[model samples]
Target: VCGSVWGQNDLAYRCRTCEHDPTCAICVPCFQNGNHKDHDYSIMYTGGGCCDCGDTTAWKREGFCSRH
Candidate 1:
C-alpha cells in the first residue's frame, strides 16, 4: 500500500490502491496530544483490517477503483 501525509497539526497514514481488490484499508498514524504544552509525536501501531465494501461500493460503482 502507498502512504500519504494528512492533517493540519498532525500527520496520518493512508493506503494506496492495488490490482484485483481496489479497495483497501487506510491507516491513521497515532499520536498523543495533551494540554500544558505537551504534545507527543509518537508512532502508534495497530492491526490492519479490511475495508468495508459497502462504504466503498459507491466508488466502485463510479469506476473510481484506484486507491488514492
Candidate 2:
C-alpha cells in the first residue's frame, strides 16, 4: 500500500493501481514510486492464495532485496 504495514513477514508483490498492497518482494523493490508509476503488478502473497484485489493483511513492505 503506502508503506509501514507492520514490518511485513515476507513474500510479496502487488500494485494494481494501488488497490492497496505490495510493489515488490522477496525482500525489496517497491517499483515505480512517483504516484505508483508505470503500473501493472501481481503475486500479492506467498502464504498461499490471495488476489481477489489485495489483502494478506493489507500488504505493505516497500522494497529491499527484490526478486519480483
Candidate 3:
C-alpha cells in the first residue's frame, strides 16, 4: 500500500485503467501528480480504505508513486 490513510468521509481517487482491487485507491495529491490523469479515473468518498499506489498486490505493474 501507499500508506495513505483514509476515513469513511475521505475522498479517494480510483483508476479504472489500473483495474486494481476494489478496496484499492490513490490519494488526491498522489493522483494529480501521477500519470493516471490521461487514463480513466474518478473521485470517490471511500467508506474507508488505503492508497495502493505502490502496492504490487493491487496493481500488477505501471501504477506507482515515488513517495511509496
Q: Number of the top candidate by lDDT?
A: 3
Clashing pairs in 1: none
How are the candidates ranked when ordered by TM-score, highest leading? Answer: 3, 2, 1
By TM-score, the better pick of 1 and 3 is 3
Q: What's the TM-score of every candidate structure?
A: 0.20, 0.21, 0.79
Tens digit per residue, CA lDDT, model 1, 1-68: 22433334443322222112432323342111111123222232224443322234321222222343
Residue ranges of candidate 3 with Cα displaced over 4 Å: none
lDDT of 2 by residue, 12-41 (tens): 555555444433332124343323446465
Clashing pairs in 3: none
Ranking by lDDT: 3, 2, 1
Candidate 2 RMSD computed on C-alpha atoms after optimal superposition onto the true structure: 11.1
The candidate scoring highest on TM-score is 3
TM-score of 2: 0.21
Q: Clash totals for all models, in order?
A: 0, 6, 0
Model 3 / residue 24 / CA error / Å = 2.0
Which 10 successive residues of model 1 have the least lDDT summed?
Answer: 30-39
